[PDB]
Amino acid sequence: GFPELKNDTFLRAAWGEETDYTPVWCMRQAGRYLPEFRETRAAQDFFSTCRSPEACCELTLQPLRRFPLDAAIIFSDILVVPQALGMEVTMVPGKGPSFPEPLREEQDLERLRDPEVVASELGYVFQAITLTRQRLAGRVPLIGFAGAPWTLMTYMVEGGGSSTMAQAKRWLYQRPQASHQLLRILTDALVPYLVGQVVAGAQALQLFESHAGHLGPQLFNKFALPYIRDVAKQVKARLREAGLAPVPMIIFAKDGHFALEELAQAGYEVVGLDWTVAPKKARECVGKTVTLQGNLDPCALYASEEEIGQLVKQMLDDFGPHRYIANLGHGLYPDMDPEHVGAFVDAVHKHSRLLRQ
Amino acid sequence: GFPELKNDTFLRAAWGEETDYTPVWCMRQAGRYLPEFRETRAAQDFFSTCRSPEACCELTLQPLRRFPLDAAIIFSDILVVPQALGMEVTMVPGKGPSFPEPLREEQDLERLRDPEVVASELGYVFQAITLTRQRLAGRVPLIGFAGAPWTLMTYMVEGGGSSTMAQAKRWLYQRPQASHQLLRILTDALVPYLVGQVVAGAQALQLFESHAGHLGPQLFNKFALPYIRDVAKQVKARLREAGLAPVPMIIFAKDGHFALEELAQAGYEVVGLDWTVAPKKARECVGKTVTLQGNLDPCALYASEEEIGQLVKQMLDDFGPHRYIANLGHGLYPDMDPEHVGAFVDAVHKHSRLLRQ
């Protein structure tokens, strides 16, 4: 019941197919760097914005009116999941996200909802997705998303961001069983949520393991990787059983250089990269099968439009014209210039075509 | 004029020689995890502690009374250099280091001292070094240290820590010339400071590029690597001209997985590693010449003493018995248990001997 997709370059690249140019989108393309985003967000408090389908739809569409991006990503927040699990969150503008009552001991898991009921608590996200898919009218694909189990665990235990994740890693080392219990609750809530996002209209899904870097290989393979593999396996299985077509799935492990090899075998069509991994080395690590996404340093956007063009040209030369979706190595920062974001988008389109003809 | 060194295992490993066991030390071994450190530090404000030779000497010796560490590192702070350069710093316990008036525009470089006069401003550090070298009475080598140019630049421009280094990276992209000017001022101040540390008694030097990870390969090679190479070249040159023996130099680029290959050719005897780089991959990157230092996840110390022993055994199996100095992948955290630090030290000694016999 949705408009037929007109530009599917993003999906074709995600599946590994040859395309006429490299598709490009930007993490946080709906963000504070756009004045219109700030104005729309000023209408209510953060989570009240996430709960209004029209407001999410509007924020999602704003970057598309400025730039010819090849995908839209639904406006929402990864913290909606721990909130639907029963945790109270606050988004204080100066600080960032906060859980005044973080999980600290094993007994604290008792206050969480059964993960099976989370998707019903997240109906507002499904509404925003259906609405935006209708309003996009098939212009480009709509990407749905959620935080990965370990990363969500970090927010729940730390109560917000952290430079070391010492409290959450302390849980991995001192409370391994409780840790697995929590990661499994998170996985069991994420699967039906992600499946519901596709049922509502999402055409691709991205799992954000933004806090992967704090773990080295060993802890990552024990506590992050199994759940990352499970999410993809179970989402595809449920979509099949429901009669729907699976969608391409992207795993983004920020600062996860050490896990690229396992990630390329984790059941995701696309492996997203941060800007610290040289494209050619990433290609060696992942192989010739998966599609890579990324990975320009977001701060490169502070350089002139002309320099941005050169940096993009070099990035595309390293990735090559196959199995690649362009994006930054992390989300856009609040003080970046919309014109520089436009320069980024245009350079990818221009240089990827030159690189094929 | 100093006591002859009794245990030189650390220096022999640093130079790449075979030793009977693997020497081990810990970044922040003089730190808040020790109750005696907190008590000694409570006597005065942070920088007043750094300025008292006896207080620095005492803090340096405290961990050695608890554990048979193979090296001592002088108690000081990397921020003493920008302070001697003319910047006002404050060490507020709740927050951390702070420069209320950070460098933000190019003209702000005019308030800094000529780097040639910095070493005279840092005479108190030379005094603490001479004093501790005397009091150690040759028990183990004394390591001197400083922050690397890029990392010091980050504190000067950001005014403290940051999860993105967006202001400092904005300087790299928008003010490249001013950036090089500042990095060169920092290099020109670090060289005579590090040379003075050895003249005062330091037997090894470690340069802490703690904020390397925010840069990817390209920016790192343009702005961090040249100055890192220059520091080692010029320090060795000045020591030679002065009639002194150069000392082994360690370059520690935290989150610098992408630069290991260049770092191994940067003129340092030892390349320190964070815990995210698997030891075997680090060995492939650096080659068979340089000594590696590291790299246990500091949070591993939250595990039981018995688990710490196994994790250490595995770490040593990966590094192998040659060209290796054991250490954590970053400094000890304030809430770690001194007994677990002892367990770490003992496991390295025990397992490295088993691995040779």
Swiss-Prot record, chains A, B:
Q: Subcellular location, in the record's words?
A: Cytoplasm, Cytosol
What effect on the protein does mutating H211P have, as reported in its record?
Answer: In HEP; mild form
> One of this protein's GO BP terms?
heme O biosynthetic process
Reported pH dependence: Optimum pH is 6.8.
| First-tier enzyme category under EC | lyase
Gene Ontology cellular component annotations, sorted alphabetically: cytosol; nucleoplasm
What does the record say mutating G147D does?
A: In FPCT; decrease of activity
Q: Which residues bind coproporphyrinogen I?
A: R28, A30, R32, R41, D77, Y155, S210, H330
Q: Which Gene3D superfamilies match?
A: 3.20.20.210
Write the Enzyme Commission number(s) for this entry: 4.1.1.37
Q: Which GO terms describe its molecular function?
A: uroporphyrinogen decarboxylase activity
Top-level taxon of the source organism: Eukaryota
Looking up InterPro entries in the UniProt record yields:
UROD/MetE-like_sf, Uroporphyrinogen_deCO2ase_HemE, Uroporphyrinogen_deCOase
By its UniProt entry, which Pfam families does this protein fall under?
Answer: URO-D (PF01208)
Give the record's keywords alphabetically.
Answer: Acetylation, Cytoplasm, Decarboxylase, Disease variant, Heme biosynthesis, Lyase, Porphyrin biosynthesis
NCBIfam families attached here? hemE
Clinical disorder: Familial porphyria cutanea tarda: A form of porphyria. Porphyrias are inherited defects in the biosynthesis of heme, resulting in the accumulation and increased excretion of porphyrins or porphyrin precursors. They are classified as erythropoietic or hepatic, depending on whether the enzyme deficiency occurs in red blood cells or in the liver. Familial porphyria cutanea tarda is an autosomal dominant disorder characterized by light-sensitive dermatitis, with onset in later life. It is associated with the excretion of large amounts of uroporphyrin in the urine.
**Family of the protein in this entry:** Belongs to the uroporphyrinogen decarboxylase family.
Subunit and partners = Homodimer.
Q: What is this protein called?
A: Uroporphyrinogen decarboxylase
What is the native source organism of this protein? Homo sapiens
Its ancestry begins with: Eukaryota, Metazoa, Chordata, Craniata, Vertebrata
